[PDB]
Write a protein that binds this ligand. Sequence first.
Ligand code: HEM
Ligand SMILES: [Cl-]
Length: 179
Amino acid sequence: STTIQYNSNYADYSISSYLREWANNFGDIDQAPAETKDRGSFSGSSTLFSGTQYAIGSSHSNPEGMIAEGDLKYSFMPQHTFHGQIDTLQFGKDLATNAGGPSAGKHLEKIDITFNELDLSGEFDSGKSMTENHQGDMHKSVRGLMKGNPDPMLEVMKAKGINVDTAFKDLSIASQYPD
Ligand code: HEM
Ligand SMILES: [Cl-]
């Protein structure tokens, strides 16, 4: 089952109210100056467009970041589809590069919310249209977030049985990180 750990400072937020605020501070990547644009960084397979970790900070010089872990793949040109399976999704601020450099992964210095066993997946077929491939849950939810829009991620979570309006302290699948 999907479970959540959250920082106590977010006890009164819901998943929806947390992602509203994270997404507006992250900002839309398509609106960002090409000089501060962070498209994200894959690590784990010593390659550029796949790996076991995908980490992305804000393109609008704000501290907000997001990290996904699983079996992660990105088709780049021409359909630009993120697919595979996300097992862990983590939100917070202050995205730092591990001592081994970008190829050794990144970590959030301030961790706000972690989804465990998210089972967020999507498939990619080069023989289909970009619009069909862009219907995969994984793709549309992460892409929405990159664009400052949390609504597709929230729709995915509702369809999985998660109430995105319940406060974290009242959510039966959520545990606070220890003081
Ligand atoms: C290291 C990771 C990534 C890099 C280096 C990267 C790089 C790029 C570049 C250079 C373009 C411009 C393509 C062109 O000029 O033809 C592009 C487009 C695009 N990327 Fe990525 N990208 C990355 C990750 C992702 C992820 C994870 C997603 C989805 C969640 C994504 C979705 C898109 C989309 C949808 C476009 C086309 C713009 C649009 O139709 O909205 N990218 N990417
Ligand atoms: Cl991008």
